[PDB]
């Protein structure tokens, strides 16, 4: 990457970044089949299988609760549009049409009555064990069975389900991310594939599943007999490898600081601005930005990087009366504003101070620095381009 400092304005510009723009949401509806547990009873007394059966029955009882708690949250940013999706799939019609679509195959595309298409996935392993292997030997209504191997298989097969309940119970129906028990690695792989974009975008998302899980989330539909229904909204990064640049600034004092700080990515030649820090997130030299939280700015805005006194675009630099000393760290360096008259020093991690800095603005690189210190507070240099 190239990072160049602007003596005027006391800002920086790190160019050479490559976009990964979240342009849409893919919807993956899951059916976690449990296998009609509550029809099985434990009359043998205390037993290991009886502990595991109560755990599963207590789990969906609590899951039926958490759905009930957040349906009552209806009074009347991408999640608020995502529960609207969850509204249409919660009906008994869609659930049945979804379960019917998955009777034959473990995964298929189901066309919703609302004119949309979601991916339907079936995780049957729990119900398959509860019906074929479990309910056969416990059919006596006595759980103190001889095969201890069955109780340990019960613990292994129901773990994914128990964790999903814990996941939805703690976050009250909507997780902040796609976890390993919401979707496995393989289930994630099939979903991103099914997305409507080309091979390059599929390749990058498959190489960066951790960003897919990060920006994706999940909503709980509810229990329908022995079927935990929940939807997972996966991000669709439909535009990649476009130019991006970050311009972070310190107050230059005589006193002004640059208000159009933050991330900028081009999409189809139209430059777009990401003011908030959580809109964009970086992995190496790639910038994952939220398209929805984006502001289309005119391309004349790159004039703030040659001379701000250019009346082709109002660069909207802001002014303050009381000068404030600050340090805004950039990815490939640091800009230190030291206008109040304090001791300001560049340092290293095993040599100590390298040079004392003057009163004002001065840009530093990691090539000849590792820290920057004012007073007793020290700022460790790093590539925190994810900082605003």
């Amino acid at each position: 990457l190239k990072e160049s400092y602007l003596e005027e304005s006391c800002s920086t510009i790190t160019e050479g970044y490559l976009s990964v723009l979240r342009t849409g949401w893919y919807t993956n509806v899951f059916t976690l089949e449990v296998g009609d547990v509550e029809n099985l009873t434990c009359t043998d007394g205390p037993s290991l299988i009886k502990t595991e059966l109560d755990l599963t029955k207590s789990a969906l009882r609590e899951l039926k609760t958490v759905s009930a708690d957040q349906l009552a949250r209806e009074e009347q940013a991408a999640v608020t549009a995502g529960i609207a999706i969850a509204k249409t799939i919660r009906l008994e019609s869609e659930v049945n049409a979804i379960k019917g679509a998955l009777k034959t195959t473990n995964e298929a595309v189901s066309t919703l009555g609302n004119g949309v298409r979601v991916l339907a996935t079936a995780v049957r392993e729990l119900k398959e064990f509860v019906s074929k292997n479990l309910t056969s030997a416990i059919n006596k209504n006595k759980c103190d069975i001889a095969d201890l191997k069955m109780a340990v298989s019960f613990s292994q097969f129901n773990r994914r389900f128990l964790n999903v309940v814990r996941q939805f119970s703690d976050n009250a129906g909507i997780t902040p991310a796609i976890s390993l028990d919401l979707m496995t690695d393989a289930e994630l792989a099939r979903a991103v594939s099914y997305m409507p974009t080309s091979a390059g975008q599929i390749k990058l998302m498959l190489e960066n599943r951790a960003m897919v899980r990060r920006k994706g989330f999940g909503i709980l539909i509810g229990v329908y007999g022995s079927s935990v229904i929940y939807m997972v909204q996966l991000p669709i990064f439909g535009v990649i490898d476009t130019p991006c640049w970050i311009i972070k600034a310190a107050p230059s004092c005589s006193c002004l600081l640059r208000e159009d700080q933050g991330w900028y990515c081009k999409n189809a030649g139209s430059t777009v601005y990401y003011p908030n820090d959580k809109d964009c997130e970086t992995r190496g030299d790639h910038v994952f930005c939220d398209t929805a939280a984006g502001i289309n700015v005119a391309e004349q805005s790159r004039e703030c990087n040659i001379n701000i006194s250019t009346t082709n675009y109002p660069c909207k630099v802001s002014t303050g009366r009381h000068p404030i000393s600050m340090v805004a760290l950039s990815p490939l360096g640091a800009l230190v504003a030291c206008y109040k008259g304090v001791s300001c020093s560049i340092g290293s991690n095993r040599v100590g101070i390298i040079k004392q800095l003057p009163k004002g603005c001065s840009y530093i690189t990691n090539q000849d620095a590792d820290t920057v210190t004012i007073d007793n507070t020290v700022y460790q240099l790093s590539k925190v381009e994810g900082e605003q």
Partner: antibody
Amino acid sequence: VQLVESGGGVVQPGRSLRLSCAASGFTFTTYTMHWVRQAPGKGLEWVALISSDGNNKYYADSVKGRFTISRDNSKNTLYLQMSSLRAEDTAVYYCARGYYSGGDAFDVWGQGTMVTVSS
Amino acid sequence: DIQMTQSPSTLSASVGDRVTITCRASQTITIWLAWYQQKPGKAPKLLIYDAVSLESGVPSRFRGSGSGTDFTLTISSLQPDDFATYYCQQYNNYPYTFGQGTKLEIKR
């Protein structure tokens, strides 16, 4: 289903040492591998990771520039080439397995081998 | 780096008690966290990955809870095995940082 570390011993400051980690019981070629070290008494400190294929290797700032992580999926072995060893690098070194693609929780660890860098 | 702050550093409790160790990250780490049980001279044993999900083999007395920056780990009924040192770990991004550790001592 186990990892076994080897190559630890006593060395002088500035010397070199190669740790190897033998993997067995799982599809080693699929998993992203790590080295995590723990000085005597102190807590845990991640040092390095290497991806399933090897294109992406990353190190902590402490060992950055001296240590080099590598792998050979043919022999199911994880490597760490330690150079410019200082006394701070005295620690037990475990190799650990990443849980899932992007989730680097360490679900399988090795016995650990003791490295002693003292003059 | 993301600084992981555990509390308390030392927790002294008896068999049968419930016990809550808290982890705190300097930045938001979503739900990417792990809790390890380390006994003297042995490798750490993973207990719960992500925020609340339990690893295979871990008893149900272990409970996770957390989102963003503030996470907890609660052992609902102390068994003599549970007394060790517990660590939290973020894996939001590298470098992967651990907590100071929490020593679960028995009270007398």
